[PDB]
Every structure is written in C-alpha cells, then in structure tokens.
Amino acid sequence: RPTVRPRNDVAHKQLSAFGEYVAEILPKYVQQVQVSCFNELEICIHPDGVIPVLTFLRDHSNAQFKSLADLTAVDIPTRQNRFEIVYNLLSLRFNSRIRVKTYTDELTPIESSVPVYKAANWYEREIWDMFGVFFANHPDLRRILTDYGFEGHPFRKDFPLSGYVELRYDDEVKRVVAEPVELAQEFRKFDLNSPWEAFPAYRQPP
Amino acid sequence: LLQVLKRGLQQVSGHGGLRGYLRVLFRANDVRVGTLVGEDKYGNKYYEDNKQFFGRHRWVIYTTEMNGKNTFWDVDGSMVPPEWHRWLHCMTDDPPTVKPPTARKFIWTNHKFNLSGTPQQYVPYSTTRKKIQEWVPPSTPYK
Amino acid sequence: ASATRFIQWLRNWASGRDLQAKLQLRYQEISKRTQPPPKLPVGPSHKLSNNYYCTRDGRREAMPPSIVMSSQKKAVSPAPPIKRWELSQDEPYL
Amino acid sequence: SNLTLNFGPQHPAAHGVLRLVMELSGEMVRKCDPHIGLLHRGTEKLIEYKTYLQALPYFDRLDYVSMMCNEQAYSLAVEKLLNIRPPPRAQWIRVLFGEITRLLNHIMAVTTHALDIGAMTPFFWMFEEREKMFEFYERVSGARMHAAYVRPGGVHQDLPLGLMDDIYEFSKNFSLRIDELEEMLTNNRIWRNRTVDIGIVTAEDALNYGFSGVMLRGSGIQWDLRKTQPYDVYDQVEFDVPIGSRGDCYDRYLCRVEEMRQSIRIISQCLNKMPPGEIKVDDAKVSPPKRAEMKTSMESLIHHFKLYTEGYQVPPGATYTAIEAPKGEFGVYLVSDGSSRPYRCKIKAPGFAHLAGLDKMSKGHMLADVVAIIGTQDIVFGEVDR
Amino acid sequence: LHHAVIPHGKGGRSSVSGIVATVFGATGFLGRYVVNHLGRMGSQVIVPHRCEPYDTMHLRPMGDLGQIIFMDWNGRDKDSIRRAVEHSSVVINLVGREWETQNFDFEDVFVKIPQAIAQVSKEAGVEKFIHISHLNADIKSSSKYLRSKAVGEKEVRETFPEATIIKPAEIFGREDRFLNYFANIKTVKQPVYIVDVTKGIINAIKDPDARGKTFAFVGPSRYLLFDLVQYVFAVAHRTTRDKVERIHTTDKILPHLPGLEDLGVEATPLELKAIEVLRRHRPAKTIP
Amino acid sequence: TSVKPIFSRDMNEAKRRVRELYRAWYREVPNTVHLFQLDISVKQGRDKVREMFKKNAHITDPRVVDLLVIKGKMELEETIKVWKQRTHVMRFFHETEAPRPKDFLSKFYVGHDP
Amino acid sequence: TYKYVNLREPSMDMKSVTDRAAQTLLWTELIRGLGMTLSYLFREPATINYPFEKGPLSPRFRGEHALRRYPSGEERCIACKLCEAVCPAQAITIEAEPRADGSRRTTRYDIDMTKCIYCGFCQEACPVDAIVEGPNFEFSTETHEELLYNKEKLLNNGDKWEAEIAANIQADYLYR
Amino acid sequence: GEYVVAKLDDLINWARRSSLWPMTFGLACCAVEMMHMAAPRYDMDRFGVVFRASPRQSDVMIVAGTLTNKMAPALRKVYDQMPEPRYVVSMGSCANGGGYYHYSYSVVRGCDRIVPVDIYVPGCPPTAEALLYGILQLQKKIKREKRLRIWYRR
Amino acid sequence: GVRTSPTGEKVTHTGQVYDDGDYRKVRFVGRQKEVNENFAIDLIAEQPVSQVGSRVISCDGGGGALGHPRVYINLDKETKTGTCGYCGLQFRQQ
Numbered sequence A: 001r002p003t004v005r006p007r008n009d010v011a012h013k014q015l016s017a018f019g020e021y022v023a024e025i026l027p028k029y030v031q032q033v034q035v036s037c038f039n040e041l042e043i044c045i046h047p048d049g050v051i052p053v054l055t056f057l058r059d060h061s062n063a064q065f066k067s068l069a070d071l072t073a074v075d076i077p078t079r080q081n082r083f084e085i086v087y088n089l090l091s092l093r094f095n096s097r098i099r100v101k102t103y104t105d106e107l108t109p110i111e112s113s114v115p116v117y118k119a120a121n122w123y124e125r126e127i128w129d130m131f132g133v134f135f136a137n138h139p140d141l142r143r144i145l146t147d148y149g150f151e152g153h154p155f156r157k158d159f160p161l162s163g164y165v166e167l168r169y170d171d172e173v174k175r176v177v178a179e180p181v182e183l184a185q186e187f188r189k190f191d192l193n194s195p196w197e198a199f200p201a202y203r204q205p206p
Numbered sequence B: 001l002l003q004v005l006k007r008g009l010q011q012v013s014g015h016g017g018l019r020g021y022l023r024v025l026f027r028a029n030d031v032r033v034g035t036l037v038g039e040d041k042y043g044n045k046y047y048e049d050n051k052q053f054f055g056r057h058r059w060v061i062y063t064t065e066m067n068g069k070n071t072f073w074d075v076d077g078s079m080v081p082p083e084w085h086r087w088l089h090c091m092t093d094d095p096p097t098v099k100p101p102t103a104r105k106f107i108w109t110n111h112k113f114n115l116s117g118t119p120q121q122y123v124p125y126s127t128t129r130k131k132i133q134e135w136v137p138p139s140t141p142y143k
Numbered sequence C: 001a002s003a004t005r006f007i008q009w010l011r012n013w014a015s016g017r018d019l020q021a022k023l024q025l026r027y028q029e030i031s032k033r034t035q036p037p038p039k040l041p042v043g044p045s046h047k048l049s050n051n052y053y054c055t056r057d058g059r060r061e062a063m064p065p066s067i068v069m070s071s072q073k074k075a076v077s078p079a080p081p082i083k084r085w086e087l088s089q090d091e092p093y094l
Numbered sequence D: 001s002n003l004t005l006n007f008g009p010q011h012p013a014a015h016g017v018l019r020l021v022m023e024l025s026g027e028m029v030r031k032c033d034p035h036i037g038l039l040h041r042g043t044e045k046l047i048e049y050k051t052y053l054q055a056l057p058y059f060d061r062l063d064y065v066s067m068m069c070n071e072q073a074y075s076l077a078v079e080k081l082l083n084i085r086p087p088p089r090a091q092w093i094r095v096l097f098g099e100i101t102r103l104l105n106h107i108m109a110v111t112t113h114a115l116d117i118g119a120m121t122p123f124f125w126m127f128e129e130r131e132k133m134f135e136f137y138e139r140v141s142g143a144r145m146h147a148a149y150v151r152p153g154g155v156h157q158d159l160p161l162g163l164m165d166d167i168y169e170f171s172k173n174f175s176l177r178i179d180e181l182e183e184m185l186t187n188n189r190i191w192r193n194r195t196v197d198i199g200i201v202t203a204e205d206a207l208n209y210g211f212s213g214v215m216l217r218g219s220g221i222q223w224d225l226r227k228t229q230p231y232d233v234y235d236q237v238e239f240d241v242p243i244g245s246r247g248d249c250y251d252r253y254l255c256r257v258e259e260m261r262q263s264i265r266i267i268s269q270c271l272n273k274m275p276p277g278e279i280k281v282d283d284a285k286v287s288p289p290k291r292a293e294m295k296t297s298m299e300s301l302i303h304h305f306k307l308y309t310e311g312y313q314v315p316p317g318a319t320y321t322a323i324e325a326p327k328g329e330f331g332v333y334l335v336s337d338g339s340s341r342p343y344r345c346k347i348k349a350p351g352f353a354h355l356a357g358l359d360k361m362s363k364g365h366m367l368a369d370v371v372a373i374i375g376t377q378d379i380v381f382g383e384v385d386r
Numbered sequence E: 001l002h003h004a005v006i007p008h009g010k011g012g013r014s015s016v017s018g019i020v021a022t023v024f025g026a027t028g029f030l031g032r033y034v035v036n037h038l039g040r041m042g043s044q045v046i047v048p049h050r051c052e053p054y055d056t057m058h059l060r061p062m063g064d065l066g067q068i069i070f071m072d073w074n075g076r077d078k079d080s081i082r083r084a085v086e087h088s089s090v091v092i093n094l095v096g097r098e099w100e101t102q103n104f105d106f107e108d109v110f111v112k113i114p115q116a117i118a119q120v121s122k123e124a125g126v127e128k129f130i131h132i133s134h135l136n137a138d139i140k141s142s143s144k145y146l147r148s149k150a151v152g153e154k155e156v157r158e159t160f161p162e163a164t165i166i167k168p169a170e171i172f173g174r175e176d177r178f179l180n181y182f183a184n185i186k187t188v189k190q191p192v193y194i195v196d197v198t199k200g201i202i203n204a205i206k207d208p209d210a211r212g213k214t215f216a217f218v219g220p221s222r223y224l225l226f227d228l229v230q231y232v233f234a235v236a237h238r239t240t241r242d243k244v245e246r247i248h249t250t251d252k253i254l255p256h257l258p259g260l261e262d263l264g265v266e267a268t269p270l271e272l273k274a275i276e277v278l279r280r281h282r283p284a285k286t287i288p
Numbered sequence F: 001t002s003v004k005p006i007f008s009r010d011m012n013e014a015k016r017r018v019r020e021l022y023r024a025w026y027r028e029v030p031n032t033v034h035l036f037q038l039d040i041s042v043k044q045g046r047d048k049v050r051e052m053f054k055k056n057a058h059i060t061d062p063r064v065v066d067l068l069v070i071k072g073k074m075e076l077e078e079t080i081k082v083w084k085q086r087t088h089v090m091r092f093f094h095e096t097e098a099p100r101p102k103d104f105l106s107k108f109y110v111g112h113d114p
Numbered sequence G: 001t002y003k004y005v006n007l008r009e010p011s012m013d014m015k016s017v018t019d020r021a022a023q024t025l026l027w028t029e030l031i032r033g034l035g036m037t038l039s040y041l042f043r044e045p046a047t048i049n050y051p052f053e054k055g056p057l058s059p060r061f062r063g064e065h066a067l068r069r070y071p072s073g074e075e076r077c078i079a080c081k082l083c084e085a086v087c088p089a090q091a092i093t094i095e096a097e098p099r100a101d102g103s104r105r106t107t108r109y110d111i112d113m114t115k116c117i118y119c120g121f122c123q124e125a126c127p128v129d130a131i132v133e134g135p136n137f138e139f140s141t142e143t144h145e146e147l148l149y150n151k152e153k154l155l156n157n158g159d160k161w162e163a164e165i166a167a168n169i170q171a172d173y174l175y176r
Numbered sequence H: 001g002e003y004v005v006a007k008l009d010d011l012i013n014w015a016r017r018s019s020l021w022p023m024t025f026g027l028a029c030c031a032v033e034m035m036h037m038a039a040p041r042y043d044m045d046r047f048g049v050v051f052r053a054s055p056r057q058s059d060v061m062i063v064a065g066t067l068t069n070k071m072a073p074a075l076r077k078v079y080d081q082m083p084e085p086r087y088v089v090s091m092g093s094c095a096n097g098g099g100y101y102h103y104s105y106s107v108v109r110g111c112d113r114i115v116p117v118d119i120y121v122p123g124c125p126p127t128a129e130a131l132l133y134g135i136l137q138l139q140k141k142i143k144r145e146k147r148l149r150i151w152y153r154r
Numbered sequence I: 001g002v003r004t005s006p007t008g009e010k011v012t013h014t015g016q017v018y019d020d021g022d023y024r025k026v027r028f029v030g031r032q033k034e035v036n037e038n039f040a041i042d043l044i045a046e047q048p049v050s051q052v053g054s055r056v057i058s059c060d061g062g063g064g065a066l067g068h069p070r071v072y073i074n075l076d077k078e079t080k081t082g083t084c085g086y087c088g089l090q091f092r093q094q
C-alpha cells in the first residue's frame, strides 16, 4: 500500500536467528533478545557482560561488529536502575547493525569499553558528563560538554530544562559571574497528551 | 578598444552631462545607464538592463529626500516601498507600473523606512489591561 | 558576456579552457521570475469509495518487538556476507 | 611545552570554536587534548519538550552546513517508527537536495581547508557557487540555510515551477568550477607538501576509532551507506564511491573532490527521473492536509488543528537510523514512548568520533599539520557539541 | 503603593525591586556602581547623560531589558530635569568634577546644578532625594571644591528638606582618583571603599528613617597621609592646585553624624582592596 | 544490600581517600591564589575548602563518598591544569549575591518563599 | 561501484623522468596555477551594488512577521492559538477575550523576534492566513527592546507591507 | 571653534566608518552567512570592511552565533582586549536573545548580558544581505557621533 | 477609534493605557507609543449587511482558499443579523 512502510520478512528471520545464536553462546550475560517490527535486533545483557559481550561481537567470525556507531544512555526514573546504556554497533562484513543494552543506577559503575572500541572514550565521558554514570577503568574520565565547575547532570529527567544558575558579566567584580536563574518569561509547559488511546497493539494490562 | 572607450563616453551623456554623471558616481558608485522602468511617489527611480547578469540587471537610484529626511548621502534598503520591493528583489517580473497592487484602505499611503535610533522608534509595552482590581477604602472616617 | 574579443582570448588562454561556453554569471537562461500557476496532483488516498482508513493505516500496523529469548544447529551470521564491490567501468582510475 | 590553539582563524570561518590544548617537543606534537563543549547548547534535552514536528528545525542547526541531510536523517527515523512511507516524488526530491547539500558541504569542507592553509582564492570562487545553491534552498523553502523542508512524511512543499531548469543550468557549468579548484590544489607542490602523508590512519584503526565517511574511504575501506544500506531512492541512481590508497589528508582531499563530481552525476539523474505525484504521505494523521482542504472539509480541519497543536503520536519504540551525511555517518537514536513528543533523542555526529581521533592522527607531526588534520576531518562543532 | 511598583521576585536581574531611580552623574566613578546595584535587584533606572552615548555603553548590560532608560539633559535646562525625574520615586545626584572647566566651575556643578535637581524634584513630587556632598566640606576651606560643597549641601537642604545628604571621605576603587592618583605621581585620611558607599546609598533608598538625615561615610582606619602614600608604592611595586589642597585636608571627625554602620554596612579595610586597585600598576600603621 | 563498589569497600577505606583529597586541595590553594591572581587570601581559600568538605560530613555510604571524592578530584584537576578561568574559581564565593534572609520575619517581609 | 582517486604508478622511462625534473626545476605546475588566477582578474566580478541592487528572492521568503486583515479591514486573527502552540521557540504569546461586539479577538499578540527562528511554522498553522512572515529583512535595530513585537507593531507591519504580502501569497498559495 | 569641531568630527567619523575592521566570532550557523557577506556577491571588503584582522586590530566584533556559558568568559576577554573605539554587532537570534536555545541550562540568553551591543541583526540566520544592512546601519550610527562637539562643550 | 486619556496617551484598540501614577510610561519619553489606528471593530461595522434569499448562507471570507474555513450561517431569527464568526460580515434574509 502506497502510504504503508513495507515489511522485510527475510531480515526479520535473519536477525532473529542471529539473536538466538548470541543468546546461546553468551547465556551468562544475555537476559533478553528482541527484534522490532522494522528489523532492529536488540540484546539486553547483565551489566557484568559489557566487555565479554562486546568483545565477542567485535571479534567473532560470524559477528565482526568492528565499528561502534554510537554509545548513549537513557534515563528512566521509574526504574530501580534508571540508566539504560545503549551500544549501537555496525558490522561491515555482514552489512548489519546490532544494539546491545544494559543498565545501572546512580552509584553502580559500568566497565569502560575503551579496550574493545577506542571510539567509546569520548562517548563514556559524555555519558558521565550528562547523566552522571561512572565508568570504571577509564583512561581520562571527566566532563566533556558542560562548563567547568558545572554541578549536576543535565540530561537526567529531573534536571530542570533551564538549569539552576545563569551567567552574566558584572562590572563591580570585572568578570563573568553565575547567579540563580530568573526568567523574564517562564517556559510554558504544555499538556499535549490526548486522553484517548492511540495504539491498541501496545496496550498494557489492567 | 575604441568602441569600449566610446561606450564610456556615452555613459557621461547618458547621465545628462558630467554633473549628473559625477552625481551618480558619488551617490551610487556606479555609472551604468539603464532603462527607466518607473519612479515611485518618494522620488526613487528604478532602472533595468537585461543585458547585465542576474542580480545586476535591476537597480534603484534612491531619492535625495524622503519623509523629511536628507538622503542625498544617507540611503538604505528600507527606503523602497512594498510595491517596488517585490520587483527590485526579483520576486516578480512585472513592475508595479504594469501590475499595481490591490488597493486597500488600511494600507499605508506613506511608506516609512527604518526608524530605529530615532524619536519615532518602536517601544514595546504590554497591550493587556490590569488583571486584579484592588479594594479602595472609603473616604469617610466612620471608624 | 560583455568582454571584448581580445580579453576573451586572453583569459581563455590563461585558464586553458573555453570559459565563455560555461560562464559562472547568469544571463537570460534562467527561469522567468513570474511563472504560470501550478495545478498540483493529489495522492492515492483521494478516492470517494474503497478508501477506508483502516485499510491504509500504517501506524496501527506497528507491533511491539518480537521477543526471541527472555530470562523471565548450524552457525549463522547476522546477514549473508556482503558481496564484493566491482570496479567502476566509467573511470576506474582517477 | 604546552600551547593552546586559537579559537578560530583571523579570517571569517564558520565551523565553531575549539580549545585545543597541545603538548609539543620542539616542532613536534606530543599530545592533542581537544576541549569541546564551547557550542554545547543542550539540543537533545530541548527536543524532549518539543513535538516531533517542533524538533525538526533543531536538526538544521547541527551540521549547519548540511542542513537538508540532517533533516532527512531525522525524517527517516520518524517515518520508520511511524511505519509510513514518503511518496516517490518526495524521495526523489530528498535525494536531489541531498546531493545539492553534499555539494554545499564539500565546497565548505575543501575551500576552507585550503583557506586555513593559506590558499585563499578558491574560497571566493566557490562560494559564488554556494550562493546560487542557497537560492535553490530559498526557492523551495523560503530560507537560504535552515529550510525545515524535509519532514517526516515527505517534503513541506512542491518544487516551484521553473526550479528544475535552473538547477540544470547550475549543474551544467559546475564541473568546470571543480576543474578550476583542482588547477589550484591538486598538482600544486605546496598543497601536496601540506597534505601528502599527513594524518595517516590505518584501515583497522579507523574502524575501531569509530570513523565513517571519507575518514574510512581514504584508508581504502569500501563502505558507503548509500550503497550498502540505501535509503529513499539511492538504489535507483548510478554513482561511484571514491576510494583512497594512502589514508592521508591528500587522499581524503581527492575523495571529497571526486564525491563532488559524483554528486553532479547523481543530480543529473534526479533531474531526468523526477516523477509526478504528491510530495507528502497522503495520510492526514501524519502529514497536514492541503490548505484548501483544511478550509472546506471538517475532517481536514480537525486533523490540521491536531497536527499543529498536539502533533501526531508515534508508536512506542526505539530506532537507530543513519544516513551517509556529507561528513560521514549521521544517525539518531530516537526513543518513542507512544506520545507526540520524543522521549529521548541521541544524535550521532560523525565529527564527534573524528575529533576524538585527532590526538591519534597528529602523533609525530608539526604544529601546522594539526591545522591540516582538523581540516581533513571537516569538523563543525554544531554537530560535535549538540 | 502603586500596583506597578510592588516588589516581586527573588531580588535578581528579572525581579521587580519597586525602585524607580533617576541617577544624575551615572556615567562617572560612583555612578557606575550605583546603577549596577540598582540594576542587580531589578530596578528601573533613568540615566540622564550629558555625554556621547558611546560613553554610556558600559551601563547597558547592568539591567534586564527595558530597565535602564537613557535621556539627554543639560545642567542649565530645567525642562530636561523635569522629563528625567517626573516618573521617579527617588532622585540620586552624583554630579561633580575634580577641576573647573571653561564652561562649568565649582559653583555650577556643586551649587547651581544640585539646587536645580532638588528644586525640580520637589516640584514634581519625588519622594526621596539622595545628595552626595563631602566629608571635609566647609565654607572656611582653602579648597574652592570644598567651599562649594558646603554651599551646595546647605542649599539642597533648604530646597528638599527630606533629602538624605551623604558626606563620604575620599573613595578608593578601581577607577578612583585616590590610589590611582598616588600611584601615578600633618594630614590624616579615612578613605572609604567604593562598594561600601554604594551599599550605603542603596540602603538609604530603602530605609525610611534615612530621610531628612545627613551621613558621613568613612573607612575603618585613619592613616597619616605619608604612610598611606608610602603604602601605595610598596603595594604597587614602585593634578591641579585645588586637588592638592584637598588631599592635604585632614579627614574631619563627626561623631554627631550617623555613618555606614547605621545603614547596615560594615566598612572595608583599605588593606583588603589595595591589590585589586593597584595590581595593574605593577600595611600602613593605623592611627588609634 | 550486596552492591558493586566503586573504589572503597567500607567507610574506613573511603575516609582515607577523602583525607588525601583534602591534603591535595589544602596544598593547592596557595598556588591557585597566585596563578589566578585571586584577591582572596590563602586563609579564605582554605576556609572555603573546609566548608565544602564539612557539608558532606554526615554521609555514611562508601559508594556516595567515592563519587564525592571522584567529583572533587576532577575539580582539582581543572584547577591544577588551569582549565578553569578566573571566573570559575571565584564562583565558590558568590561575591555578587546579596545575603539571603534566614529568619522567619525577614523571609515574611520579602515574599512567599519559606 | 568504486574508483581509485590516487593509484597511479609514475612511468620511469627517461623521458617521463625528465618531464618530472623539468616540472621540479622550472616550476611549471606553479606557473599553471598563476594562469588560473590571471584568467579571473579579467573576468567580470559577481559583486552586486548593494543597497542599490538587491539579491534575488522568491515569494516563499520568510522575513519579518506581520498580522493581516480581511479586505473589510477586520483582523484575520481569531485568537485560536495554533501559532502559539506550534512555535518551536515559544516566541509567541497570546491572550484573548470577547471583543465589545462579541468577536473572538486577541488582546495580546507578542512575538519575541530574538527568540524566533524564522521557521514559518506559525503561518503554516494559521487557519485564516492571519500571521505571516513578510518579505522585509532589513529591520535591524539599535536596542534589544525594539525586537520584542506587540500586537500594535505587528498590525502596523501588516498595514505597511500588505501590498507586497498579498501578492506573494497570491503567487504561492497553490503550492500550499 | 564651533565650526572646526563640527568639521573635525565629520573627518574622524568618516575615517572610522569607512575603515571598519571586524573581528568575527564564528560561533555557529550565523558565521556561514557571515562568510557569504565576504564572498564575491556582497564583498564586504569593497565597503572598507577587511577580510581578516586580528582582535587587537579590530574595530567591530560580530557575535555570529550561539554564546554558551562555557564560551562567555572567553568572549568577554576578547572584547576587553579590543582597542577603542570598539563596537559589537549581535547577529542572529541566538546572540540577540538566546533564540531557539533560550531556555537551555548552558546558553547565555543574549550576548548583551556579556558585552554592550550597538546593532542587533534579526534572523536565524539573517541573510548575508541582512547582515550587510546591519553593518551599513552601524556606519550611519558612527556618522551620527559627536565626540568633539561634546568634548568642546564640557 | 484612537483616543487620548487625560494624560495625553493614546488608547489602543485593546483599551490599554498607562494610568496617571504609572511609572512605566517613562519608556515613551523622548520616543513614541506604537499605536495602530485602523481599529478593526470600527471597520467591520462599516460593512453593509448583505441581503440573501435563503435561511442558510455560507461565508468563506472571500478569495476562496485565501479566506477562512467555510461556515454556514442560519438566518431564521428576524430580530438580528447572522454574523460570520471568522470575519464579522453580516447577513439578513430578505
């Protein structure tokens, strides 16, 4: 149908079979495997498995996920382990992508993946900077995006959008100073969610 | 090369003598002669030369006085009225002399250029009325 | 376009190309700045019948991910190995 | 000792300010420590307070030299979560303006690369061409740069009558302009002395450091997302991928110049193969209806009202979608919670990994070779910092 | 109060302090500190200036949008004083020179101009008036600067009886004519910090009892001029006839006048702020 | 309650790392005042350091202490390597922020905040 | 399909060797570059004589905002707040109430022109063509406050530029 | 005296406005349109506005892009090192008042909180022609200055 | 219908005007108060009521797709005119 995205059945079967393959080989760490309706394979693993799972996917002959495309974190405050660490990998040999996910909380360190992918060095610094997730055995873990001395982790869901402090130049002390934030116009929160369900296929149980 | 020099001399005559030639040279830094497409009510003159490359094929010679201001040396792009603004920026092919704008009685009869930095500048203010009416005590000391 | 015939030769020779065929300034070849009005077509869902939205609703055909394994044979690769690229037959070497 | 490269050149330059903390011994660079974040604006957190349409303009302002390519990446990600398909004419328009954008980026990448090295004349010749391509952007969108033209569902408006002929006129003469650029640089012994064997990166190191785009292809890696993982109609156009052999700045410079020629080759096919039809998905629950429908039909007005207030809801899910942006692989990890605002939007900027490799690529080079190496990576700190 | 001038906010840049102040002499040394403190808390500041607008640019960042308003005025034109003070709730006078010019002498800047500002301010209904005089002002002084300060201070008190008159000692600060004066070239001095005077002025606006009173702003320590000048050179790693006579005037003692402590301001020792003032040029005994 | 540690396996291990951080901060203040040419005294800078350590004295969670030490070391490096500018080092002192009323009556007069 | 950008082996016959030696010693490839810049000196420059000449624009150009009227003079805006809802920058602030004739009209219509991204989403969202981005782009000011437009400023912009705005809309409304 | 001062301001105002050497902070997008003003179509150099300068040789600073809190101290320091007379041109919504990142924790809501601004150029980005209009507006502002007339009347 | 208050300040079509004691009017000193003088309430009342011969009439504001959404107006009441809620034009059954 002209307006509907076509389904690719062959890639869904292929990625499912490879998902079982990885689950069978790494049972010590793999907690869940799923493939989305648009054919993206996700491996959910225990956080202890970061290095073994990423090394297997990089080096194994049937995996060869040589390129770390992205590494990010998602904050879900309702979860006991609020932070979800997402690794997106690319295999040039098999022209395929895979997503590997794990989790942690505010006080639990994750193992640095710099040994597996040098690309991860700055990504982990950004996750530390913006979410406050510590990576153990990182060559140089420090803020990368925020200002020096910045307090808090702005990408956390409970960090306010405009922050807590703002900058201006003060003539009395002849330097830029930081003061508690005041807004001439407050950001206008909108309630946009319709009170009618949109997607029955995703309904949660009562 | 002789014909090139002739064209240079025809620009002096094309500007109505040497005084009018030096006038546009020092006002506009350009001595090209074009076809007078038209003139607006403020005295701006509009010229075209389709032999020139796109972007130079249309130009305006600004008026020396607009809205009580001396613009002999002080010209700027905000002095072009909207009807000619469309033609000068090549949004259209037809000058307002050929396709005049629709008449509306709320449309400004007098165009105004940029008024920033003058006593006629815009100053923002809240357009809404007071929200909370206070209580006014009585004027008698009954107490 | 107004350059004399000698200057055209001079800059042609200096550059080594025939610059006049491919001038980087635009003259009359451009489109007219006033155009006739368009009459744009409509999409495939502009029907008066046989057009129920439940037969063409892409969002409602999305599904939650398939769970292959949950904690709650021959070896495979994530896809067949990529085929080798073939060298250009247009200009293999620059 | 210890230095700090200036924020930017003395001449006008548009790619952002960098604080580069350098360790040197004699003329040699011992360590490069890029201190970024000087253009970090919290885009990803702002996107969480926007509907999916309201967030689209944030993508023009990332790699703000490749505006429509960034839009296309975001649109493909949203269209994938929506499970819809943009109409074929929109796909051809998106590939057409994707390649026009690739020309815009490569002109900026190559001529500012020469301008920083001191070869400044080609910059002026080639931004007259960029000026004419800005006119194409403004004619379809009304804006010279930040068009917000490509959207989930297709494109905002259809091409104005007469635009394609003008694009043909520009494309007719452009190869000569590339030829003049090559006359100044390609065989110039000074240019080669500044670029050949500078910033060599091995194929394996490039992959492990997360490089993409020309940073991979300069080292001989045969990878182009338009070929291997095609999107829109890129599988219906013919072009060659330029491949380098020595992995240095000079080979990457040649790759970008050849990619410009292939973009002209692709644009030629888009102009000839442009099909008729609508420009946005005929699905008024995603794409707003025509203004004439909105003013006549009750259903159309309701859908216009809701699309421009609440916005369309995206089924819950997460996708990583990437395209072959002019600067490398540009991707978005977009998370939907079922509402009309994204839950999370991570932006994968190709220059983020590339600038992380500057320390590696500059080992045992001179202080002025760092200028060339940041040049060959083509860094825009809008996308590096978000 | 009028609903517009009810205080609102947390006292920051975007808050509403409720103060609408016209500051004459805002483009000088003391003026830039007063405007800064007024704009800090979200006040409406009217800055009448005689000078070229380029010379008022450093004042623009000192307030939120619309909070600093500039006007032109002439010391000899009362109509340009009426326009400036008409809508204000306090008028602050900081006009002055350390020398006489061809067009203005000390009888102009310190007697005729302050009187005109006070006379027009009174006629317009301004509630609060702040006038700056001098600690050593006296009609018997050998300095014509200090003699005119005495006459002007006396005339301002007649014209605006509720005016608050402040009498500082020599003020030291980054832009002063005091420590910078010595660093560029029998007597006891009690210099006072610029920020202490500024806080004193700002609290005088807020404090009700401050109306109708005269204050003297002095530092915490009295120094012999020789030692003070000796200290500057050590710290710094190293004019007119009338100016010299002021620097040699001993700083009066006025226990009958209230001071900085009475307005809630603690005086800052010259020791803690000498490097700040003097570093760019690269502990004296305190009298009991 | 069995949790993965960061560095320290108990509070006594953590307190050691805390004291090393204090020594490093204590010794750097005189250099910080000089390199940045601050107008505070060395005693003022050290008092601030004590103030910052003091307001975390109630913590009894070794993981939280490790993060506090980890964050404190990063701040020291930024200062030691001169990544901080003069403005950054002086933000600990809030020189331009007027004192905030603390008692009930003072807060009642100014506004509604408690 | 791929191609090699730099995979050529130089010919080592004495003639080719001598050709490269002449290039090194006589700088011939440097002379060639001088020819290209010389050829430009004699080309016509691309510069236009601003402000007497102007860059070409199209009817779609997104410039300064304006509030529009019906031919009767009644305001088109009905305070529906769709533009305020869609504005990606939250640059629009609207308040409304029944007018003295009962009409649904705004009492406040502000656009912070220093928040606006000039994206045109408001004029797409407007159901009555009330708010538009006009063709004016030469309205820089000397103060920040002059860029905080209220309803009077925007209505004056509509009355000022309507002659050209209406023509631009007439030229593009069939693409919308 | 009165006549000479009037003609003398006329001279120095002519010289300073006819030779405006800019320092551009190419912070972000707006620097691209700034480059297009230097490109051949508009050729800012033809007005006397040179291409490259150096902070310590510049007369006008053009803040062309978003100013973040991290960048704010460095921008103020450059402004402080400029020799006078010096002017600041605020180009685009970000520098004007924060623009599309106005509500961000890491963005200065207008560069006029850090430096005094002479001209505000609206747009996101302002077209190269819009910036040129703002630059020629600053020349008119300088043409209006009266430094010696004011000085002579002190 | 612009008018001035006792202080001489023009009143806007929204009824705004700073009262006598309001300091905020200092912003207009040496400048001007921007006021649009084509009051829409007065202009729409100059339009003549249209006479139609049906109970229901439709209004799109004129211009077809350049007007407002098309609405239908009931004219059964003979004690008042039917007004368009978008553009304010009035209709009466004849």
Ligand SMILES: NC(=O)C1=CN([C@@H]2O[C@H](COP(=O)(O)OP(=O)(O)OC[C@H]3O[C@@H](n4cnc5c(N)ncnc54)[C@H](OP(=O)(O)O)[C@@H]3O)[C@@H](O)[C@H]2O)C=CC1
Residues within 6 Å of the ligand: E024, E025, E026, E027, E028, E029, E030, E031, E049, E050, E051, E075, E093, E094, E095, E096, E097, E098, E104, E109, E132, E133, E134, E135, E168, E169, E170, E171, E172, E176, E177, E178
């Ligand atoms: N600073 C000190 O050490 C002490 C100062 N004081 C008093 O403090 C007040 C200000 O101190 P300070 O700020 O140092 O003085 P400044 O000279 O630093 O600034 C004086 C102000 O007065 C203005 N001014 C001067 N003459 C005239 C005039 N003829 N017409 C209009 N405005 C004029 C100046 O504006 P422009 O820039 O236009 O000239 C300037 O803004 C003065 O009254 C002084 O007597 C008292 C004791 C000590």
Ligand code: SF4
Residues within 6 Å of the ligand: G083, G086, G087, G088, G089, G090, G091, G092, G111, G115, G116, G117, G118, G119, G120, G121, G122, G123, G133
């Ligand atoms: S153009 Fe865009 S940013 Fe500006 S007011 Fe309209 S919707 Fe808001």
Ligand code: SF4
Residues within 6 Å of the ligand: G076, G077, G078, G079, G080, G081, G082, G083, G084, G094, G122, G125, G126, G127, G128, G129, G130, G131
């Ligand atoms: S301008 Fe248009 S969209 Fe905005 S409130 Fe008015 S009618 Fe609604």
Ligand code: SF4
Residues within 6 Å of the ligand: D061, D064, H028, H029, H030, H064, H065, H066, H091, H092, H093, H094, H095, H099, H100, H123, H124, H125, H126
């Ligand atoms: S104002 Fe617009 S174009 Fe300029 S930097 Fe900001 S987002 Fe980019």
Ligand SMILES: [Zn+2]
Residues within 6 Å of the ligand: I059, I060, I061, I068, I084, I085, I086, I087, I088, I089
């Ligand atoms: Zn109607």
